[PDB]
Amino acid sequence: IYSKHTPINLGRDLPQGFSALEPLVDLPIGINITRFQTLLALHRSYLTP
Amino acid sequence: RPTYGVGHQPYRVVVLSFELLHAPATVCGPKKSTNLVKNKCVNFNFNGL
Amino acid sequence: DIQMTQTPPSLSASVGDRVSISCRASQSTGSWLAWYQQKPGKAPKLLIYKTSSLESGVPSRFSGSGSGTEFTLTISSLQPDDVATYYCQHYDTYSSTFGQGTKVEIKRT
Amino acid sequence: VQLVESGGGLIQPGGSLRLSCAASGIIVSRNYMSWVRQAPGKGLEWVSILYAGGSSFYAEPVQGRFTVSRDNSKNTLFLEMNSLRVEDTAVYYCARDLQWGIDIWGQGAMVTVS
Q1: Longest distance between any two alpha carbons in chain B, whole Å
Q2: Which residues of B touch D51 (CB under 8 A)?
Q3: Residue contact D45–C94, C-beta within 8 A
Q4: Interchain CB distance below 8 Å, D59 and C95
Q5: Of A1, B42, D2, D84, which is the most buried if we count CB atoms within 10 A?
Q6: Count of H helices and E strands in chain C?
């Protein structure tokens, strides 16, 4: 799994330009995956009930 | 008791078991490096290089 | 419990004859049985342990076999050193159980 | 190795005994040793075992009654029979226990309780 973060100006979606993605930890496992999903966090203000 | 014959005295036994499979060696022991004598036509090997 | 029975209690055979004795446990012991030879006025000598391993020093003529419930010692040829009582012991780290004893004698008229 | 036992004799019921058995040719604090009694007319009965580490394992009937011990300096096994019963009469043998089992048999001490 590689990484990146651009300081690019905010827009509407994936903008133009290029930036290559650099490794973080070369996990030596690589087992097959069929379904991929994103873990999302329910954003709060730390004060709501 | 600390008053045993050598046959039954408490011996600390560590079984260092090494393991190979279809993964890279995340544990190695290459703790044998030369020094850095420089500016001569020599044989260098920077960690496999 | 675990009781082993020995047969025959009264056997008369001659030197050179085989001595086939059978010791059977009521249920499975797997391999924890040993064959011993004891003479009256003497302590038993372990003839075979694990029912298949020849004990170091006991003559190879003694062939102990068996597992679980049943076991059999076979003296290929009797000799005067074999005229004695034979026991089977269920092996256990504690008291365990011993056989009743098969007393083998010299057959005569 | 020779195991020589002493103390074989007559004792009243409920009394105390201390059977001895010297081991010669090996160090007692380096091998398992055992006490095994044979009653007159019966097979063997292994009653106790002392490890070379002093770990005493008594049979439940003899648990809390008999005390197995070894004198490494004297290299001699000792058995302190306490609260003797009528059934405690037998030829008692010290023995050497191993991975394979009981290899060294003592000459035995007679024990009569009556």
Answers
A1: 63
A2: 8
A3: no
A4: yes
A5: D84
A6: 0, 11
